[PDB]
Amino acid sequence: RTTRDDLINGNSASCADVIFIYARGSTETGNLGTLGPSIASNLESAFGKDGVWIQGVGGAYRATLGDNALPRGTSSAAIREMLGLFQQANTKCPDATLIAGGYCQGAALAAASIEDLDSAIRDKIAGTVLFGYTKNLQNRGRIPNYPADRTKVFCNTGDLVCTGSLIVAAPHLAYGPDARGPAPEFLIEKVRAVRGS
Secondary structure, X not given: OOOOEHHHHOOHHHOOOEEEEEEOOOOOOOOOOOOHHHHHHHHHHHHOOOOEEEEEOOOOOOOOHHHHHOOOOOOHHHHXXXXXXXXXXXXXXXXXXXXXXXXXXXXXXXXXXHHHOOHHHHOOEEEEEEEOXXXXXXXXXXXXXXXXXXXEEEOOOOOHHHHOOOOOOHHHHOOHHHHHOHHHHHHHXXXXXXXXO
16 A cells, blocks of 8 residues: 555565566655555566565655755755665665656655666666656756656646746646556556566
8 A cells, every 4th residue: 555665575585577666756654655556466467476675765755845946856865765765676676677656756866866866777777657747847847867768747737837937737747647648658568678587
């Protein structure tokens, strides 16, 4: 439901083929918030329960609203937490294909983490989905150092955070359809394009 720690809890001797690491939006609960569970259920349907590990970014990521204003759109402590989960995935399951996602502050966190990542781990993230990406205008719809074809950004018309502001208006809360359909569709297509483990 809103908390999933499959990578932290998972046995190294029985690694999943696909590991999904997801960062929630500001003030959301658990470590998956409102959109993460929808994506996770569809990934489990596609790869099976034992085929995919879903891992939310918890720990030091507090998803505090005011941290949207910081230079990278989140705190340094939160970036260190998500970087540590990508490193744990890489160590515990070296042959797994990774996929990532984030909503609002969590999309800025996913972009900042992926930019800072060691290139050999970054290159294993087959696809990343970003909803209500707060650095969309500033980064021109991209994640620094990461290919455009592996990125999909969902930014609604009238969601002001996509156009350089930090005002929260009603379109910002309307990503439920995307999380149920096109975002898991893109992630599954990018994993099958390369394959799994």
